[PDB]
């Protein structure tokens, strides 16, 4: 899980 975008 990226902390700066929820985009896949």
């Amino acid at each position: 899980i990226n902390y700066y975008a929820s985009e896949p």
């Epitope: 700066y4 975008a5 929820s6 985009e7 896949p8």
Partner: single-chain antibody, 232 residues
């Protein structure tokens, strides 16, 4: 179980601000994004932005940059949204939803507020409604303005049902996958740019508005909805 418990209805006047809350429980608050969605009559569902309570970083739909402010409090596991310069356009129900690996599978109950982009992916749903008799099967179509296929191999198309007086619920994720708790009478297929939700053996519990949504690229976008009702 995951719970998202939103603050109460607001009756407010134009030109003011309002701040609403979304209390999370049943999972690690700082691990997942929380998105916010606006449900305004005649205007379907519209995505506002999201926030990561671990980093406090927020992403906004450009349409809401200068309207909405997302914050989070890790002490109380609460996400907040503040709206400024309220107008009639802001009268709506506002939902928070937890993003689980791109799935908006957990939704708050909504907060009602009553006020007394060229490159965005456009999602279309040609049918405003479908009228069916119980036990009939039905197909609902959606199209996206660009492919929703990602380099990882997944197609980031989602279907939701919003039953009358309820929050949206996730039915199908990543084009074809059945969400937990949803009957396997629901299925999804598509080409990456055109999609079909199929419902076999329709029953009264299936009544409501069906929305497609893309979670490929910010801003996330929803189709205009197709209302399912039982027949004339």
């Amino acid at each position: 179980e995951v719970q998202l418990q939103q603050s109460g209805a607001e009756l407010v006047r134009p030109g003011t601000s309002v701040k609403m809350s979304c209390k999370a429980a049943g999972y690690t608050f700082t691990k997942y994004w929380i998105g916010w969605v606006k449900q305004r009559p005649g205007h379907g569902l519209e995505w506002i932005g999201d926030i990561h309570p671990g980093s406090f970083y927020s992403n906004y739909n450009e349409k809401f940059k200068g309207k909405a402010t997302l914050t989070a409090d890790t002490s109380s596991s609460t996400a907040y949204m503040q709206l400024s310069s309220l107008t009639s356009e802001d009268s709506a129900i506002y939902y928070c939803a937890r993003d689980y690996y791109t799935n908006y599978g957990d939704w708050g109950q909504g907060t009602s507020v009553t006020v007394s982009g060229g490159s965005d992916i456009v999602m279309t749903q040609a049918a405003p409604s479908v009228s069916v008799t119980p036990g009939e099967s039905v197909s609902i179509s959606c199209r996206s303005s660009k492919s929703l296929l990602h380099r990882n191999g997944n197609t980031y198309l989602f279907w939701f049902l919003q039953r009358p007086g309820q929050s949206p619920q996730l039915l199908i994720y990543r084009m074809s996958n059945l969400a937990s708790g949803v009957p396997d009478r629901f299925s999804g297929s598509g080409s990456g740019t055109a999609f079909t939700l199929r419902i076999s053996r329709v029953e009264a519990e299936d009544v409501g508005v069906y929305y497609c949504m893309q979670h490929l690229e910010y801003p996330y976008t929803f189709g205009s909805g197709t209302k399912l009702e039982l027949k004339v």
